[PDB]
Design a protein around this ligand. Sequence first.
Ligand SMILES: Nc1ncnc2c1ncn2[C@@H]1O[C@H](COP(=O)(O)OP(=O)(O)OP(=O)(O)O)[C@@H](O)[C@H]1O
Ligand SMILES: [Mg+2]
Length: 226
Amino acid sequence: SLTTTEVVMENVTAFWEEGGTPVLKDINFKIERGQLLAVAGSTGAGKTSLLMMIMGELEPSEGKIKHSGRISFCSQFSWIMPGTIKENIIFGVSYDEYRYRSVIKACQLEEDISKFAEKDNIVLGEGGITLSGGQRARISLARAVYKDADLYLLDSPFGYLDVLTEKEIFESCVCKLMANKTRILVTSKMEHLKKADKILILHEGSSYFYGTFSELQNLDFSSKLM
Ligand SMILES: Nc1ncnc2c1ncn2[C@@H]1O[C@H](COP(=O)(O)OP(=O)(O)OP(=O)(O)O)[C@@H](O)[C@H]1O
Ligand SMILES: [Mg+2]
């Protein structure tokens, strides 16, 4: 009877356009501190909107959202500010060389940085147009992981990566480096769902499944979707 709960949603319904159809309807879940929740579902299902509710950017019309803590958010827009790679990753936080190194290794940036003589000190322009798609994605993830937060909201960080790079980062970063952090990972990959503490599958704004992977194996659409 000591509770470890970090995020709760109870009977949550929300509208982006207050009057039409809800973007999220009757959503219920809870995440305990240090757990990984995988959020899956087709394009447009409401996955990012769910993260937005957690961040206070979308308010419910019904229900309650409970969370107290610092959030770090890795958006679908893999964005880059003018400045160095190092400056992009640290992004206004205090510098901790041990932490910085652990994050660049876990996000598979070691080999990319170590390529130039100027290492991670070379200035990027806004957009980081001289980087590869995957470099931009990894720098964006590294930024979110470097922040010292209580809840990590990782919105499909692996979209632009090849399947081998994605596997290595999911294992080193999400599963290992962040093992004791509360994480919500938007992903529909079945291998990732296996490793999650809990799973929420959304469909057209409603909950299609919520529970453990063993509870999912016992039941489908998810096997088509993943
Ligand atoms: N800020 C917003 N204002 C108005 N409508 C929005 C907003 N954000 C999302 N929507 C709409 O709500 C629906 C759900 O969008 P959302 O971004 O949550 O989907 P998603 O599950 O993240 O999809 P994807 O996998 O494509 O990223 C979409 O039809 C989208 O057009
Ligand atoms: Mg999205």
